[PDB]
Amino acid sequence: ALALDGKLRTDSNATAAASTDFGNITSALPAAVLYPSSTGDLVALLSAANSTPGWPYTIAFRGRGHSLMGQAFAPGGVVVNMASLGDAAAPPRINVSADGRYVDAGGEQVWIDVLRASLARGVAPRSWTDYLYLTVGGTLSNAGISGQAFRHGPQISNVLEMDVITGHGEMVTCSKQLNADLFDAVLGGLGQFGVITRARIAVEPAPARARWVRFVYTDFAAFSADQERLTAPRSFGPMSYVEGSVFVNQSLATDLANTGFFTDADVARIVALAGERNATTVYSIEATLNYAAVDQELASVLGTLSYVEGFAFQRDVAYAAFLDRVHGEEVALNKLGLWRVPHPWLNMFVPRSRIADFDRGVFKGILQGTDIVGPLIVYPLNKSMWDDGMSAATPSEDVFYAVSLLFSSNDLARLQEQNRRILRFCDLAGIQYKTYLARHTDRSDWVRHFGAAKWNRFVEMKNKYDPKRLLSPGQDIFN
């Protein structure tokens, strides 16, 4: 029925396209790929799966395939090409509310398009990812983090309601007020319980511009203390965005130039500073202030900090230009053939109490004497802005750090071994980290990830909403 309407494709080109992802490390061929024209086509697929004894196929929902390790694959199953839902000109897949207090976006829609539609109405989401060509449904199935998360929470903390089609093939609207169990389960739920077809996203009046700063440190203690100062609850401080970067000695000049922030003269100055201090690691805080008045506001904030004098670097850009900054990085890297390469990325949340230990073992230890390509990102988050009732798993401490080591790749094998070594260091040091964007491959690891109480809830929701265990099998939780 769906195949006759040209929606369910089994041809080699279709299956091949749905068999690889951004990670470029693992691959898995699906039996078929659905190209739905409407949510009705998704209901039809999931209802058939629910009602058919001996239903053969697991089902995955491909956003834009930005997964690192096959999370969007359905080996010998059906991959849903979610993007197809946004093919038609009418009706619109992104609706800013009449009063401009929220935006309704299709699960398949990319955040860059959500931004553009929001700005047309003078508004914008409050919480972002660093990179905007990701789907609403995709990031909400994980968490969605960037430099705003310390004060607004992750993207999953900025959703009012969702439309979800469950593994039973039932279309359900959920929120804190209605079907809250499904609402909580789906958010950070790794595509396990149903497909998000619509999410209601909180917005704020859009700032016009961003004052954009980078501050340089050679001392980790000063660097991390200042990050924590900038992101501390008062309500929060003036800064709209706070992240940080780590630069190892061997690839210092190259990595500093690769930020796209520093000029060649700026890079030379930082290299000279590291040299005079014999520093093996350099650290940079990246922060923005959304808006003569800005000058004094910025001066007042910087006066509370302890970066190396003479090493505050400033840019002033349009708000939208700041948010979409990484798009220009992709275009440039792809032209050099350096974008579509293996990405053995390591992402985790590290408790505040152990971040100095992590720095000693990893940045000052394991990563020393290697040529690093890709950013090493480190910044604090506030647990208070996360809802522990949702599926997403975080460390127990009030403050924990996002640590994102975004390695680009003989080299791949070395990098995979290096990541195993970093994880081994953390385990032996007894650091109670949580991975982010990673899939585990056995039960014990997944139970450890969630913790006993949250795992038991996760299973309860799985039995209620996907009892056949069909959905997002690439997560390797129930498959």
Ligand X SMILES: *Cc1cc2c(cc1C)nc1c(=O)[nH]c(=O)nc-1n2C[C@H](O)[C@H](O)[C@H](O)COP(=O)(O)OP(=O)(O)OC[C@H]1O[C@@H](n2cnc3c(N)ncnc32)[C@H](O)[C@@H]1O
Ligand Y SMILES: *[C@@H]1O[C@H](CO)[C@@H](O[C@@H]2O[C@H](CO)[C@@H](O)[C@H](O)[C@H]2NC(C)=O)[C@H](O)[C@H]1NC(C)=O
Ligand Z SMILES: *[C@@H]1O[C@H](CO)[C@@H](O)[C@H](O)[C@H]1NC(C)=O
Q: Supply angle C-alpha 125, 94, 393, rounded to 5.
A: 50
**Per CB under 6 A, 280 contacts ligand Z:** yes
**Per CB under 6 A, 340 contacts ligand Z:** yes
* Region near ligand X per CB under 6 A, out of 140-148, 212-220, 300-308, 351-359: 140-148
Residues in the chain: 479
Instruction: Answer yes or no: are the C-beta atoms of 166 and 465 closer than 8 Å.
Output: yes
Residue nearest to ligand Y (CB): 91
Neighbours of 379 (CB within 10 A): 26
> Does the annotation list 86 as a binding residue?
no
- Is-catalytic flag, 243? yes
- Is-catalytic flag, 11? no
**Per CB under 6 A, 50 contacts ligand Z:** yes
Q: Which does residue 244 touch among ligand Y, ligand X, ligand Z, none (CB within 5 to 8 A, set by kind)? A: none
Cα gap 201→93, rounded to integer Å: 13
In 3D space, the residue among 469, 472, 407, 475 whose CA is nearest the CA of residue 437 turns out to be: 475
Least Å from the CB of residue 407 to ligand X = 13
> Does the annotation list 146 as a binding residue?
no
**Per CB under 6 A, 20 contacts ligand Z:** yes
Q: Which does residue 95 touch among ligand X, ligand Y, ligand Z, none (CB within 5 to 8 A, set by kind)? A: ligand Y
> Does the annotation list 262 as a binding residue?
no
Q: What are phi and psi of 10, to 5 degrees?
A: -120, 0
Cα gap 147→444, rounded to integer Å: 32
Cα gap 431→353, rounded to integer Å: 9
Q: In what order do the strands lie in the sheet with 59-62?
A: 8-9, 32-34, 78-81, 59-62
- Is-catalytic flag, 286? no
Least Å from the CB of residue 25 to ligand Z = 6
Least Å from the CB of residue 277 to ligand Z = 8
Looking at the Cβ atoms of 108 and 255, the one nearer to ligand X is 108
Cα gap 207→126, rounded to integer Å: 10
Segment 66 to 95, residues that bind ligand Y, using CB under 6 A: 90-93, 95
Instruction: Answer yes or no: are the C-beta atoms of 119 and 206 closer than 8 Å.
Output: yes
Q: Which of 51, 304, 334, 456 binds ligand Z (CB under 6 A)?
A: 51
Looking at the Cβ atoms of 147 and 374, the one nearer to ligand Z is 374
| Three-state SS sequence of 142-171 | CCCCCCCHHHHCCHHHCEEEEEEEECCCCE
Burial label for 56, CB within 10 Å (0-12, 13-18, 19+), is exposed
Segment 220 to 259, residues that bind ligand Z, using CB under 6 A: 249-250
Instruction: Answer yes or no: are the C-beta atoms of 69 and 438 closer than 8 Å.
Output: yes
Query: In the chain, after which residues does the backbone break, taking C–N over 2.5 angstroms as a break?
Result: 234, 291, 409
Least Å from the CB of residue 417 to ligand X = 23
Looking at the Cβ atoms of 48 and 302, the one nearer to ligand Z is 48
* Two tokens, residue 155: 């993207």
Binding site for ligand Y (CB under 6 A): 90-93, 95, 104, 106, 198
Binding site for ligand Z (CB under 6 A): 20, 24-27, 47, 50-51, 168-170, 249-250, 278, 280, 340
What residues form the annotated binding site for FAD?
Answer: 61, 63-65, 67, 71, 130, 135, 141, 145, 196, 436, 472, 475
What residues form the annotated binding site?
Answer: 61, 63-65, 67, 71, 130, 135, 141, 145, 196, 329, 404, 436, 472, 475
What residues form the annotated binding site for trans-zeatin?
Answer: 130, 329, 404
Catalytic annotation, residues: 66, 130, 243
Binding site for ligand X (CB under 6 A): 22, 60-67, 71-72, 82, 107, 129-131, 134-135, 137-139, 141-146, 190-191, 195-196, 437, 472, 474-475
